Amino acid sequence: ADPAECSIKVMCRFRPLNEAEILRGDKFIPKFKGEETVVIGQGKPYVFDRVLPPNTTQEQVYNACAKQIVKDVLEGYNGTIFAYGQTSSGKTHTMEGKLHDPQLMGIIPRIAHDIFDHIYSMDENLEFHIKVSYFEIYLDKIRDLLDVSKTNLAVHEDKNRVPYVKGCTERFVSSPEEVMDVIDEGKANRHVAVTNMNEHSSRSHSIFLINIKQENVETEKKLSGKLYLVDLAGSEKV
């Protein structure tokens, strides 16, 4: 069958001014036009797949940026969502938010719930196997957040010649709560041997990987899709 072409989607989220910006009286610079454009002063317009103003709720972010990825992964595509932007621009708010709060939780916890809501309604002939892994990269070294004794995991290539982290803990999960248990576990473990979490989290990448495998027991076909959910280190210059 022939493959399809698809562009990398780009959504831009402007968070509200922060406590220091408001107390310093900072002006709000962006100007919005329609659902996709933003202009900074007299500069040329920037057009994205979506521009999300400060008044966007976490659930509106999720619908605009991640809801489709979950459907795509459940059809057997590989899918990746990464957040990018300078330290304090809102990356962790976006990918995690307040993890267990229904209104403030971010993208990762909402995907943890939505993957199960879709699976419960799928075809009765399918058998599912979902394994998650949680790791970080700091000074070009990979530490397993589910086993912090492993602080230099290597990258190898899988059977489709695709790079993957070798030797990383993998946990099979069968509910949104089991996914959130892994995240809670890795969040706590990450403080181990870190002497400043504010600085560390700003200079490190956090990667949550959800590997979704499906088998049609009648047709004998299998689909699989790896969904990478990445919270990059800050992109600011020295």
């Binding site: 910006e21 610079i29 932007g85 070009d140 070294k141 200079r203 004998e220």
Partner: protein, 100 residues
């Protein structure tokens, strides 16, 4: 000057090269992070980037660098297919059917 994170200059170099159309010596190997993202940026993957920005005038130069990263990234295309696996017996049946 340079990005605080060398994996972030590596990532800006990878997006720039891909946005240019160069894809020869695109520097994925400059960092583990860009190695892990190689398939999301030039492989068999449907990728979405959420660029996060402060709306303060104080952050304007960093904001513009983030918007430029997004504008370049959005032009990148990938060729994608679902990851389907067939047993050898079903695969041979489709082949024979496709061959007749």
């Amino acid at each position: 000057a340079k990005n605080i994170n060398k994996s972030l200059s590596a990532l800006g170099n990878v997006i720039s090269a891909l946005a240019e159309g160069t894809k020869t010596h695109v520097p994925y190997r400059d960092s583990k992070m860009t190695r892990i993202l190689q398939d999301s940026l030039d492989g068999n993957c449907r990728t979405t980037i959420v660029i996060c920005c402060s709306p303060s005038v104080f952050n304007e130069a960093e904001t513009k660098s983030t918007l430029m990263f997004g504008q370049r990234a959005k032009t990148i295309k990938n060729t994608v297919s679902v990851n389907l696996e067939l047993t050898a017996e079903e695969w041979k049946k489709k082949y024979e059917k496709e061959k007749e």
